[PDB]
Design a protein around this ligand. Structure first.
Ligand code: SAL
Length: 115
């Protein structure tokens, strides 16, 4: 139980790379992405976003061993960054942070290309 399979390790590595990324000032870009607020706290959001996504949702799937491959988890991250960029303005901080984290996601996945 305590030992992760290779796929499980890779999933975890990608998830963690995005979660733990910090910029030069020590700011964890993941902060606002961990958990999306409520439909009642964000009326305009849920009416605009077809498939809402946050890192806690991704982390829960992973922990339930529900991702079958790396691409499946990447797709959810991509949904999240797409959602953030859709809702928010191109000059907004959330939008910029979503672009940075997107790069981290693809770099990490590619750096693990074999393993
Ligand atoms: O724009 C947000 O505040 C947001 C927060 C968490 C997940 C996706 C998002 O677009």
């Amino acid at each position: 139980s305590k030992y992760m399979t290779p796929m499980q390790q890779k999933l975890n590595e990608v998830y963690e790379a995005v979660k733990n990324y910090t910029d030069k000032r020590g700011r964890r870009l993941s902060a606002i992405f961990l958990r999306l607020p409520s439909r009642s706290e964000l009326p305009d959001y849920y009416l605009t976003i077809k498939k809402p996504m946050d890192m806690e949702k991704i982390r829960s799937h992973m922990m339930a061993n529900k991702y079958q491959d790396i691409d499946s988890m990447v797709e959810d991250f991509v949904m999240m960054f797409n959602n953030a960029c859709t809702y928010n303005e191109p000059e907004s901080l959330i939008y910029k942070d979503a672009l940075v984290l997107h790069k981290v996601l693809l770099e990490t996945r590619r750096d693990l290309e074999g393993d």
